[PDB]
């Protein structure tokens, strides 16, 4: 995959790696929401490989907006 070709380009130019560079390469879900208090916007994020809101590995138990 070209993702592995990306990873050598980051490792060579930075001289190292953190997970901050790991999550930016896979994908990201960046969603506008708006605040009930002071009308301003804010962003809800679910990473790809994460355990949180929408996550590639960890969705037991997934939650519904049915109520």
């Amino acid at each position: 995959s070209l993702v592995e070709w990306l990873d050598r380009g980051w490792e060579a130019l930075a001289g190292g790696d953190r997970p901050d560079w790991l999550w930016s390469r896979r994908s990201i879900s960046v969603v506008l929401r708006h605040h009930y208090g002071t009308k301003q916007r804010f962003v809800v994020v679910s990473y790809e490989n994460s355990v949180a809101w929408g996550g590639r590995r960890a969705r037991p138990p997934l939650l519904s907006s049915a109520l």
Binding site: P19, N49, V51, R57, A58
Partner: protein, 291 residues
């Protein structure tokens, strides 16, 4: 002069075959209770290591050699055995010849630790005692060869016999009584590691249950980091209580007991000068201790 020499007196009554074996054992490692000028040979023999009742096993010989003091025999008079201790007498002289009982060859610049004769015998008839000489094999092999023999004992409840050092074969199997002589070391391994791998698994209740290869690294790195966020990354916070914190201390002492046993510190380094670098079996090797 100012060189220190222990003098071991032989009790009289030696038969002519018995002195010939003691004539032959010139460069070997010999332990002794305390550094002293004059001393009997009864404290040298293998019979002096007993606790009962019980001839000591491989575990006790590792424990004894910390408290016993290593010495290398010099020239052997018919009157007395003159030996110099390694830890005090060698710091002035600097060079002591040493013959291998090991079948493994020695390169130049190697660190050498001492191993009890578990890898695999002199007994005196007239004086009614036995002699067991430890094996001077190199220290990187010493953490290996001990751990290979432990790995065989776990299989008692692929080939482990392959050990190739500096272009030579070794056969650990070569049998019967070697396995039962080593049985006490095997049980203190498994009891240490399984008590290790329950307390860590109780303090962190989801090490194995955590997701594989990516969340575990993220759990590793924050624990691996230096920053102040330490305790909230660890702890999970009538009926009986698991005595975990007492089981911490009893396991740490047992782990702390085995640290002194299985270090196998480099007592001896060999510096070959005016000769071949490879020192083979049955050859006197010069010894230089740390300055």
């Amino acid at each position: 002069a100012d060189g220190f020499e222990t003098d071991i007196a032989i009790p009289s009554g030696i038969s002519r075959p018995d002195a010939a074996a003691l004539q032959r054992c010139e460069g070997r490692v010999v332990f002794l209770p305390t550094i002293r000028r004059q001393l009997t040979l009864a404290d040298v023999a293998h019979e002096s290591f007993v606790s009962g009742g019980v001839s000591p096993d491989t575990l006790g010989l590792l424990l004894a050699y910390r408290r016993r003091f290593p010495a290398v025999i010099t020239r052997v008079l018919p009157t007395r055995i003159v030996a110099c201790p390694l830890d005090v007498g060698l710091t002035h002289a600097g060079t002591v010849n040493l013959r291998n009982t090991s079948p493994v060859d020695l390169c130049n610049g190697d660190p050498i630790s001492l191993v009890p004769p578990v890898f695999e015998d002199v007994r005196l008839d007239s004086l009614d005692l036995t002699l067991r000489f430890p094996v001077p094999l190199p220290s990187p092999l010493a953490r290996e060869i001990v751990a290979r023999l432990v790995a065989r004992g776990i299989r008692d409840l692929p080939d482990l016999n392959v050990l190739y050092y500096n272009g030579s074969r070794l056969s650990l199997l070569a049998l019967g009584p070697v396995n039962a002589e080593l049985r006490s070391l095997v049980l203190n391994m498994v009891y240490s590691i399984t008590e290790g791998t329950t307390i860590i698994l109780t303090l962190i209740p989801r090490l194995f249950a955590l997701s594989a290869q990516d969340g575990y690294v993220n759990a590793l790195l924050q624990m691996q980091s230096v920053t102040r966020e330490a305790a909230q990354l660890i702890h999970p916070e009538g009926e009986r209580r698991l005595p975990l914190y007492e089981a911490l201390v009893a396991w740490l002492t047992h782990a702390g007991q085995l640290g002194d046993t299985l270090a196998l510190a480099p007592v001896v380094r060999v510096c070959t000068f005016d000769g071949a670098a490879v020192v083979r079996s049955g050859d006197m090797a010069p010894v230089i201790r740390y300055p």
